Subunit: 205 residues, 6 copies
């Protein structure tokens, strides 16, 4: 990553073993549950394209997902190249292409040079947006169940039903009342319209 030292210049620091290990574990434990994406974003704070490639490449399973992600990255890179065509002056900074942003045709020195320029060309932030676009599609694809099949069981506590319902909506990126069991549905119908979630959960407790 690129960090500010104790004296206030932006410098390159090695990715820590703690960071590397945290990412690999979360993917092992959680696969592409939606909460993996904000964890990815937090663990890659200040990342260079080189560091982002490290994090993706260190994943050993889920290789269908990692191929789908490469495809998304190649589409965003090709759209970058459409919007930002490029033409080198000795000693001067060249303009990045899509494949430079994705870290496949650029060196770590060029990446640092772009990211610490005045004004900077935030190649790490741009690449991370492409990656997250790709990861969101994977989360959606790996979602096991439609929101239409989340219905409250006859003996299921309302809180447990709402937890399943919002967990599914999150992964898929009045239905709550419609899919409630007969007993809660009655209670909820009687609350009247524009009830908060707190009020519905209180009523059905």
């Amino acid at each position: 990553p690129i960090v500010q030292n104790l004296q206030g210049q932006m410098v390159h620091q090695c990715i820590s073993p703690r960071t590397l290990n945290a990412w690999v574990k979360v993917v092992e434990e959680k696969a592409f549950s939606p909460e993996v994406i904000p964890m990815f974003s937090a663990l890659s704070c200040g990342a260079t394209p080189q560091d982002l490639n490290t994090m993706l490449n260190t994943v050993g399973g889920h290789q269908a997902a990692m191929q789908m992600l490469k495809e998304t990255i190649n589409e965003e890179a090709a759209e970058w190249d459409r919007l930002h065509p490029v033409h080198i002056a000795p000693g001067q900074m060249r303009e990045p292409r899509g494949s430079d942003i994705a870290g496949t045709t650029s060196t770590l020195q060029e990446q640092i040079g772009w990211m610490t320029h005045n004004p900077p060309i935030p190649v790490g932030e741009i690449y991370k947006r492409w990656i997250i676009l790709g990861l969101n599609k994977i989360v959606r694809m790996y979602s096991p169940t439609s929101i239409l099949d989340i219905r409250q069981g006859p003996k299921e506590p309302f809180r447990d039903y709402v937890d399943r319902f919002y967990k599914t909506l999150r992964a898929e990126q009045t239905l709550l009342v419609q899919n409630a069991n007969p007993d809660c549905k009655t209670i909820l119908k009687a609350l009247g319209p524009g009830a908060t979630l707190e009020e519905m959960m209180t009523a059905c407790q």
Copy 2:
């Protein structure tokens, strides 16, 4: 978070993997037991709105609770907007709206700019107050038992009863004597009024 370096300027630092992992674990282990709230407050010391959103978004379960929290945050944001209406001068700091404080319509650069201004606009401290308001309502809602149902068993040591009693009061946010078993109740009645808790526990040992 925003920290002071070794040379005494306020600078942005990445959220640590240690911090991220501590929060996720405590929610996995403790759910919305009341002691989770002072842990949240301690783990988010110096946080930007971006960092607070990271911590909330990295929770994978309890999605009914996290929806209730979004609702509370939207109410506080709307009250902010009532009290502090806003109208940009090139290069100058804009005034934050509710959604800027909650980190949904502001960038990390704007958040740092507000929090390190002279004088600062403590957007992270303001947002954290809204979050804690929301978390306290959740703790109260998830409290399993009324204080009225905490009564000392015929064979239950007085200390164990008092522990259950104050654990429940804490989550719900002379009753102690009234709910004691016959044997302790006698002892306690005879101590006379304005006995300390130490004196009651000593007497019933």
Copy 3:
């Protein structure tokens, strides 16, 4: 806590996740065994009143003990207010009351201001003394056995007996010879007076 940086000014630092987790675990594992108190004192080195409240508030069980501690803290605060009455000049440091020292009516900024003043008002050290007074009473109360009931068994090695004896004395805050078994008691009587513990343990080995 308040620490000296690498350049020698006293500055505020966030409580670490390592510190927070160490305290919670030691209370989970050891409850109010006497050795918990020197651990508390070591983990709270340089603490502000805010940090001390964090550490106490993050404990989830033992809520009878934490209520007894609040009582002790309120007594010490009221005695502070007796000895040090208070009357604000724009921009000037106000004098702390008992409730300021205990961190309930003071901000973190005021606490840092007191603790780093020339000369300082060590509000964190004062509060920590009150807490430790309260914790010692709890250790004493939770002591399972009287020293009078620690007697050496007919087959118990003398070393194991002495370990139980001094473990109990520590928690309760010639008896050793009197409570020894017949065989050691004989040996010990014959050593004559003013024998060291090393000499008694050697003799009874």
Copy 4:
């Protein structure tokens, strides 16, 4: 490794116990699965030849692999010596030979001297390229199965098949359709040409 301190000079730092332990574990757990190579590259960021030799030498098993790697390193060193022949001036920097780059005939002081020269001779980056060449050959050799033997089972979900297929291709460094089961193959044939992987996985879900 060679790192920049807080004041911006390139200095030598000891390899951390965290780094050493991370590498040894990943080799214990993953052997020569392909994802071990990007982990090696990330854990050896800024490494001297001495540090790279440490990491290789601390591996206790897989000694057939570590002998094959020595062979590859000796070939690259001999090609270095072909391209860059060498001839010492008192106090002056000598030119490195292949065996200097691999750290067997150079001291740590010479290695730092080369790597921090203006302009630098990046002996650590050169050696790491040789090592990675050698590691890729080992990954290929230890690949258990040909891509030709990865075929979708009659009851195997398409996603699980694609995961095995791309895991194998990765280690070996229209076949996907040809090796699909009869049911998916039909669906896939009907999609028409130039379907993305996302579209094939959606269709076969």
Copy 5:
């Protein structure tokens, strides 16, 4: 402890939770095996008397041992007071007594003042010598077996016997040949005098 910062002044630093936890564990796992003493010495590098008392006081068991240690410390303190009698000038450093060195009648500020004086009065190093004197007596006392009872079994490999023999000598602070079994004893007698341990172990392999 007292450490040098990044800028080269000697300053006080809080004892780390890592240090505190390492000590407590090693005593839990190893009791007073001899290797506990060099671990104590390494974990207390730069310690103040306050820090040394922390480390001793955080031990929960072995209270017979910790009482024996207090006795040894009181003897060394009384001998200090014999050799170095003391008589305060406003603002000036007082001379330490035995009980000041052991940290019972001195403040942390006085301890830092002594240890960082020019020239320094190394109260932490002096106290640590007293503690180690006391710990060595405990190791000796807790030694389970006399060296006279370490004899090689008829089926015991010579290496395993030598390991037990030197483990015992270490704790107790030609016998090796005399206590060998008949078969090795013959081999060893025939080697002739002034054989190294390597030669004896080779011969008996």
Copy 6:
């Protein structure tokens, strides 16, 4: 150890609990497998003689080995004294003897003084060479099997045989073909001379 701070002077730092614990564990887990030696060398980077003695003394078992090591160290120290005889000028640096290099008759202050002198007397590097000489003899002695007894089993995969073969050669510090089973031996004989290990392993797969 002696490290460079953030400002570029060589200063003494305490051995870390992480370092201490890593060494003790690796000896517990691996005994004197050959890979323990490069781990020792990496964990003792920048060590003073005091730090090296700490690491050796913290090992609790293998006391026959640690006695053999003391013997080797005493031989190297006596050869040092032969090559470098010594004769003190008030305030001046004395010349080190063998026992000074091994840290038994020198203080930590003298050791730092030598190691940071201009030019330095690298007492830590010299002692570490003696230790490693001693450790290599121990690895050799504890090697369980002769290379002559490593032969490929009739059902043993060639890769597994080569792993055992090079693991043994490493500890002992055309035989490969001679000790192969009949089936591989045939294949290998037919490859012709000067085949690489990669080619032999490919052929026998």
